[PDB]
Design a protein around this ligand. Structure first.
Ligand SMILES: C=Cc1ccc(O)cc1
Ligand SMILES: C=Cc1ccc(O)cc1
Lengths: 501, 472
């Protein structure tokens, strides 16, 4: 009786069951080869590679599961891998997945429960410091010109305040530096709470305890992906999704609680004063730009534990579509729809098209609601921008596009049709000059805007002005929407009879 | 022997040979059913429908050939129908077709040859005024809420000064004697099923069809005036154009995908006074809407040809030009040679201003509302590369230059459904999607996909062993 949301190995099992996993049992070099295979699989929406035979791997450390949230063919449900993180029907649509994530926000939060060490797979093998040799792991080198081997693409950082009452679960790319150290680049909006500020206040910024966990319950790795509100707990929300407390055990060398069925757990200390250059990485917009960016904190690994035949899950970002579009984009879209509901905005749905590399947020507007506001394009677009761009939700978003309710925003054919035909270029875009820029956006980081880090966002109005006032009847000139139902039905019925295959 | 560029019926035959044509022999209503079947075909890049059994047809008048320049599957050559208009091999890429069209500008123009009535198939049947009843023709009603049946969507208007203009422009049947066209006794000819090279040239000239074909177009005089018409037309309507007499050309589903309703404006009335046609005549029809139909494929690629010629003549460092079908022919994408750009010693602001002025103050940039500049690592004929470049390489608004003083394309929905429709000025822009460093020097980054992100060889190694790993 499989539970993909709770057990990473059950998640692996259902994929296999659905002919959506390929067990690659021949030697594959973690240098470039793993990433290339993953990239081919991503781009044609093919089954996920499980590399059971990596060059340089010991029996236990490790295999690699690539593309844990890529797309796959429609018949199996194209967002099936995301649905299994939440334990949903695999043919659930992304629209319904997002709605379900909002529904879970109504559920009662469910704190983690501590389980016995002898039952917890992640404690099966336990290494003291002297046995920590990060450079002997078959850590993948994912893109050409990457600054180093990235071990942490799909694990969970676990950190805590000194008084142990705020625990933070999050994902942030983590590069191996040498045999004992890792450095991770965190990119976050400003004016949100930092775990480090707690330790820097009591003067221990040099020895902040951390755990890094791989192959955790898939609901957990999904929830720690993007922008959950400041009050809500991460673990308590994963519990509501699981309908059960996340099973956790304590770390060997510190007080942190890690998920019991993790594949791998690394423990140690990070230092805010001891820094290292975190050389470049192929990112969500499709580029590896040269240049190591400003020094990141150094993480010292002092202990680790893992299960038999451990599996490292990996995300290899680039061109659509991978985890950085499908998780990151849909989590933002979820928070964006939630924010809209709380503010009274007449918003039906929200999505970040994979073709726009998670730089576009499309808001599907209810026209009857829009009309009740008795507002104008100019007023509405400013109102929408302030709400989203001057908030943590619009952080990664550089363009917000508003469309009427006749547009299926989850189908990019319709989105690109509405974008292009329904807004006057420039005159129907509203610039936001003084809001916070997303540092990763290539047009930001490859311009002088990388210094100011302000502006370069816009709200684009793709709602006809008449649609702000009254019903506006036009014909959409395609086959399924241009013609009476029935004519459509008849033509479809007779299609093979006409001569078409 | 087949010459599809020269002869419409050879064109139909090469489509059959290639299984790119479906002869629909059951009864089909010209009211909506023709149009919907065409839209279904266009939208899935499927074989052209030839309706041989129209409700209301006589034996000769007429069958309908739909989708004459639609797209088809890639294995047959996705742009095959366009290549057959030019007599090219059907697996010719659209880039090569655009390059061939520029090349034709070098060739000797062959004037059309007059042939005697006896050898002109369009003269087989001749109808004098009293026998003209346009409403009896099985003219298609193509979209819901069209203002009328449109007889003219893929035919050729011919007009001549009193002592020669070949144009395509939509035409709506008004009554038994009158057609009205979108824009006292001016003679005109209206020809259907002309030589395919001719209909392509008239899309955005008679002598220039000669340069495409390599031989002269056979022509013949009208019955009631001095206009020369293609000898092998399926049908020829002859008559009188008046500008004093006007009619409301009711709305029509157009190239951007909308019928905007009850929206019309007065247009000159054409009076049909004679007709001639051949045995079993065929009416070619184009049903515009969502991508991809003729208005994106023919119009777009003719604009790209001119745009590339204009670039060369101007000294702009432009490699290729294309109007992506997904953007409904509103976007012109220009592929820039970075060495060229760098040799110019220019800036985004200067270059965009110069590119815009060249294109938007000219009839070439007429239908284009946004011009997109990209470096030469972008294959602009692949829209997956274009939308990637557009989104990630320009700053919204800030990397965009508005042109407010230039002529607007009236059909653009954001124009026509706004107050800018009473002015027809402005609403255009040039969008820089070239990184600022690329204006100055070599800028080497990694494109993070499979085919470009990895050393080929590894790409070949993975492609080999793909089946052996377990993939299908
Ligand atoms: C703040 C979100 C975020 C998403 C992706 C990434 O690589 C860094 C930050
Ligand atoms: C001049 C181009 C053009 C394209 C379509 C249409 O309906 C009118 C003009």
């Amino acid at each position: 009786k499989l539970n993909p949301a709770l057990e990473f190995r059950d998640f692996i099992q259902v994929l296999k069951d659905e002919d959506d996993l390929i067990e690659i049992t021949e030697e594959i070099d973690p240098n470039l080869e793993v990433g290339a295979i993953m990239r081919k699989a991503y781009e044609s929406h093919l089954p996920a590679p499980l590399f059971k035979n990596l060059k340089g791997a010991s029996k236990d450390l490790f295999s690699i599961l690539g593309c844990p949230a890529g797309l796959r063919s429609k018949e199996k449900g194209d967002h099936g891998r995301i649905a299994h993180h939440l334990g949903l029907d695999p043919k659930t649509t992304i629209k319904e997945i997002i709605d379900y994530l909002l529904e879970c926000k109504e559920k009662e939060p469910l704190p983690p429960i501590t389980v016995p060490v002898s039952s917890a797979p992640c404690k099966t093998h336990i290494l003291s410091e002297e046995k920590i040799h990060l450079q002997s792991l078959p850590t993948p080198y994912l893109h050409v010109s990457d600054g180093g081997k990235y071990l942490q693409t799909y694990g969970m950082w676990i950190l805590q305040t000194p008084d142990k009452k705020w625990t933070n679960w999050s994902i942030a790319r983590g590069m191996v530096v040498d045999d004992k150290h890792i450095t991770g680049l965190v990119i976050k909006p400003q004016h949100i709470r930092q775990i480090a500020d707690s330790w820097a206040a009591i003067g221990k910024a040099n020895e902040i305890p951390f755990a890094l966990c791989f192959g955790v319950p898939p609901a957990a790795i999904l929830v720690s992906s993007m922008p959950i509100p400041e009050g809500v707990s991460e673990s308590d929300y994963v519990g509501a999704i699981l309908g059960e407390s996340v099973p956790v055990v304590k770390c060997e060398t510190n007080d942190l609680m890690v998920p019991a069925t993790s594949e791998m757990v690394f423990e140690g200390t990070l230092s805010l004063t001891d820094t290292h250059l975190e050389g470049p990485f192929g990112e969500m917009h499709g580029y590896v730009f040269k240049s190591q960016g400003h020094p990141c904190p150094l993480y010292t690994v002092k202990a680790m534990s893992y299960r038999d035949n451990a599996i490292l899950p990996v995300s290899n970002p680039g061109l659509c579509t991978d985890e950085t579009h499908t998780l990151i984009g849909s989590l933002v879209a979820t928070e964006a729809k939630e924010l809209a509901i709380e503010s009274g905005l007449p918003i039906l749905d929200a999505f970040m098209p994979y073709e726009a590399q998670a730089l576009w947020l499309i808001l599907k507007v209810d026209l009857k609601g829009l009309q009740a506001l008795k507002t104008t394009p100019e007023e509405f677009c400013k109102k929408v921008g302030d709400i989203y761009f001057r908030t943590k939700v619009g952080f990664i978003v550089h363009e917000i596009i508003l469309v009427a309710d006749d547009i299926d925003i989850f189908n990019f054919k319709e989105v690109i049709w509405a974008y292009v035909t329904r807004h006057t270029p420039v005159a129907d875009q509203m610039a936001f000059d003084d809001v916070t820029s997303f540092p990763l956006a290539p047009f930001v980081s490859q311009s002088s805007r990388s210094k100011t880090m302000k502006g370069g966002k816009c709200v684009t109005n793709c709602i006809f002005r008449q649609q702000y006032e009254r019903s506006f009847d036009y014909i959409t000139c395609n086959f399924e929407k241009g013609y009476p139902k029935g004519l459509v039905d008849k033509v479809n019925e007779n299609w093979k009879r006409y001569g078409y295959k």
